[PDB]
Design a protein around this ligand. Structure first.
Ligand SMILES: [Ca+2]
Ligand SMILES: [Ca+2]
Ligand SMILES: [K+]
Ligand SMILES: [K+]
Ligand code: NA
Ligand code: NA
Ligand code: NA
Ligand code: NA
Ligand code: NA
Ligand code: NA
Ligand code: NA
Ligand code: NA
Lengths: 505, 506
């Protein structure tokens, strides 16, 4: 009964360690269900929890088992039950573009070549493919050289989705996890299902998800589906027959954090999931710092205010908003380019003022130590982009009325009470740099949402019908209230710089 | 004998060539490397700021009328301009007039003497309280008055007040002065920000400002080169300016779609804009491509080289002045950092030698990296995070290697010199597909058809609208090129394979 649930993206390894090895785990997730519920989220998307070679989980070796680092199948079933009991759905990261090169299917294809049932699961050859783009090779025990295609590299051989066996195997994976209680799927690398290069075959990849959608919805009509199509082009995003993450809006906001004429209409993708950061990007807070060249601590409050304003927008626009774990406390982080790469935007969630306490994950500390990184005291406290006592923690923000955490909790709690946002259509009313205004309307409620992201210039509009102000936000003073004020059709309303309002019919 | 679209080489003096041994690239060093520049096929050099300034990059100026001492003397500069001129190379000065250093004597006087200072009107200053207002800063003078001032880029970069006619007169005077030194044109820093109370405020007002600036400069020197740095990927914003600007839209589009995209040329077109693939504020293009493909291994260098080469080919044949950032021609690597260093790693010592060391090699970064505790890439030892000894990335290793990026670029630039249609011609789009970029260049003296297929997989084809002769073929996948002529007739069909380019002549 909620068309546009709020999604929380969790990296299990960095959330909560329930047994002391420093690694976030599945029982750890269950132990933080109260925090999730109070945050106001409707669903969790987990980064991959299948058995996999690498820490991030995107190179899978068993689709039907749980990564041992995270726990057991029993743990997973229990956690799904706990989240459900708390009104929270579970979205599974489905990684079917490729497997690990350590997947038993692939190992068998390498060993037994054309005699292997899995030879046709992949894109393989015994003919020399040296020098060809994205082709790799292994030598099996018989000394034979086996060539295979792998867009993402030698350790991620591509699956052959022209094989009906592979399609049946995808159906079995879907069936299996639906039987465990999973509520939907986030489909990894949805851009690349087909294509002989990075930007080849988006039409064929989109077409693939017609059969996939039909199958999943046949088994579970209310299933959540979202594809990761890593493109900022609205045409590419709109091609897909399933919802996708709206990278266009995300990039637009990052490029124009003080607004831009036409921002909403120009980056609109119907039914898309709205977000500001994820496990593949610089953290949004850090991006804003870089944008403003404001890297010092006296600029934190300045940055917080701009961040909050764009969260407000994706929480009120039509579509499902996605919060990346820790985004709600302003978690910082930049991708690196060696000797570590995406670890620093996937760091331990900061529960504690001091950076340490019960359940605190710290798996990164050994990673950073072995890599020789001491910047940010990373090799001792585990985080390049967080320090003890710096205000970035759940503990420090929890009872602070001006924290980003409590703003987000406030808006998400507000959101639950308004069917026009949860289920409604949308009609853009204004789409200017300093005046974003849109109606949300379901059969039960009609709202007008307005926001001025410009730090300098006010704007105004005339009411089209009688409405009541039910929310006011002042991002510059960082205060908000729900005092009701009536307005009449024909009345002019001024929207000051960095304010937002919601009016109700 | 005019060239409307000269090839520009962007030089960071500190990182090019050290002529006196302190490890700091200097102006005499530039003169000593004039043969390399001429032979590369460069028509003009744009120098990062060489005025007296606080920081290593030069963008916080304390004297518009003197040369930074790290780089040399005014006499050095005059001789260097002479040397480049004698070699057919023009000189473009980085003109930084949005702001000065807070250590500029004008600003110091304004703070100290307030409304009695001749320079009070030069800045955006006030004795009224501005606490809490964004981009407002203050200093307290010797009389204990708190002086407030606007500084978009920060407290140490107070904005000049361009609504003041005194500041307009000062700008005229700076321009006149450097013109009298033989400077051939100006790259205008932060042209997006001349006006505006915030980062994205006042672009129209800033564009309007350059009408009077252009009119004044051209009145003094009709053939002056002008290009504004407007840091925006929006073609409408870029096209608003009455002077040429760097085409950030095309650069971002190529970086986002390095295997082509429908409408690439037309959707990112900015008339008279300067074309480029990297600069001193961006990740190096070679490194960008590595990240894009997740190909950071040395076994992938060849693969990356080929892609880099085809986009250089494009910006060397499209209408506009192409700009090469120093070391781009050997595929120099580099990522911006976010602490303890920032843009230093994309502004590292030019790699002249296979070994990393040799006469004139700059190494000013070695101390920077040592003091910041950076040992990655052995940087505290050889001064480069993003270069190693004997790794193939140097002028020495590439200069006589037939398949090097340097030899390809040098080849195309010297080819370019012989074709008036590129140097001076108009442009007419013929095809604008992901796997078929094709456009005419035509001057009164020559007509060309340029064709490129950046798609690594899918061929395409077109039909000739008139008889033309193929005068260049480039195979990027095999990394070979040739100028053996082949005639073609109107109505004849031509197939453009993946990763190939052609130039046909009427
Ligand atoms: Ca902290
Ligand atoms: Ca080298
Ligand atoms: K992934
Ligand atoms: K600059
Ligand atoms: Na654990
Ligand atoms: Na694809
Ligand atoms: Na694929
Ligand atoms: Na830290
Ligand atoms: Na020197
Ligand atoms: Na501006
Ligand atoms: Na300014
Ligand atoms: Na090095």
């Amino acid at each position: 009964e909620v068309k546009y649930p709020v999604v929380y993206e969790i990296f299990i390894r960095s959330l909560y360690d329930s047994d002391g090895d420093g690694v976030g785990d599945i029982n750890g997730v269950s132990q933080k269900v109260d925090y999730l519920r109070k945050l106001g989220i409707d669903a969790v998307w987990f980064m991959p929890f299948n058995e996999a070679v690498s820490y991030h989980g995107y190179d899978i070796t068993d689709y039907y088992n749980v990564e041992k680092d995270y726990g057991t199948m029993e743990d997973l079933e229990n956690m799904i039950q706990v989240l459900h009991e708390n009104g929270i759905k579970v979205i599974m990261d489905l990684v079917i573009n490729h497997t690990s090169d350590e997947h038993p299917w692939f190992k068998d294809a390498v060993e037994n070549t054309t005699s292997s049932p899995y030879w046709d699961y992949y894109i393989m050859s015994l003919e020399d493919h040296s020098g060809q783009d994205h082709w790799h090779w292994k030598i099996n025990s018989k000394g034979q050289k086996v060539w295979y295609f792998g867009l993402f590299g030698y350790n991620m051989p591509d699956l052959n989705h022209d094989s009906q066996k592979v399609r049946e195997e995808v159906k079995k994976i879907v069936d299996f996890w639906i039987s465990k209680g999973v509520d939907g799927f986030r489909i990894d690398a949805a851009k690349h299902i087909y294509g002989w290069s990075w930007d080849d075959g988006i039409q064929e990849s989109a077409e693939y998800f017609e059969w996939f959608r039909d199958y999943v919805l046949s088994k579970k009509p209310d299933a959540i589906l979202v594809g990761e199509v890593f493109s900022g082009n609205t045409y590419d995003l709109s091609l897909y027959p399933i919802p996708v993450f709206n990278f266009a809006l995300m990039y637009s906001i990052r490029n124009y954090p003080e607004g831009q004429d036409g921002m909403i209409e120009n980056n609109w993708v119907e039914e898309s999931f709205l977000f500001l950061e994820n496990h593949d990007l610089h953290r949004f807070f850090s991006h804003l710092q870089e944008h403003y060249k404001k890297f010092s601590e006296s600029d934190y409050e300045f940055i917080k205010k701009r961040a909050a304003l764009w969260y407000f927008l994706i929480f009120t626009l039509k579509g499902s908003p996605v919060i990346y774990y820790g985004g709600e406390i302003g978690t910082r982080g930049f991708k690196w380019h060696g000797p570590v790469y995406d670890e620093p935007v996937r760091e331990p969630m900061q529960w504690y003022a001091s950076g340490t306490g019960e359940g605190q994950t710290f798996w990164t500390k050994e990673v950073y130590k072995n890599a020789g990184i001491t910047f940010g005291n990373a090799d001792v406290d585990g985080c390049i982009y967080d320090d003890p006592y710096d205000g970035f923690s759940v503990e420090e923000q929890e009872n602070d009325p001006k924290s980003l955490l409590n703003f987000i909790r406030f808006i998400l709690n507000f959101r639950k009470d308004h069917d026009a946002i949860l289920n409604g259509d949308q009609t853009i009313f204004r789409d200017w740099k300093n005046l974003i205004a849109f109606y949300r309307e379901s059969s039960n409620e009609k709202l007008l949402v307005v926001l001025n992201p410009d730090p300098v210039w006010q704007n105004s509009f005339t009411f089209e019908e009688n409405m009541t102000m039910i929310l006011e936000v002042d991002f510059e003073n960082f205060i908000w209230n729900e005092s009701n004020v009536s307005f009449s059709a024909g009345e002019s309303f001024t929207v000051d710089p960095m304010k937002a309002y919601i009016f109700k019919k």
